[PDB]
Amino acid sequence: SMSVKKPKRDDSKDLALCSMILTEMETHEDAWPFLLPVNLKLVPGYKKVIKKPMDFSTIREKLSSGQYPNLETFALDVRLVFDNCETFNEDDSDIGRAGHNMRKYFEKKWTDTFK
């Protein structure tokens, strides 16, 4: 509260660290469904069903241009990608499997880097 501060968690390296995690996810061999925005004109259902589309290249642009106020807003966009994937894809499909695999991969890097 007013004039009562908890001690300052050092966040000075967060941009660099998030950029590294994003780079590792971009180069993962199962990242191919997630590299570019889904084509809303060519994929039936996607525009109507998926209210907030998200992908790694959009996350990369937003990170490079100061559009993430903090750590957590970045992690929310990464998870949005995999949450969208689960909504639209069967668990037993290539894209669906890629999604579960990438989420697991991300969450471990996230824990090891920041927790």
Ligand SMILES: CNC(=O)c1cnn(C)c1Cl
């Ligand atoms: C991330 N992409 C998807 O979820 C998807 C599912 N089917 N198609 C054609 C696409 Cl593109």
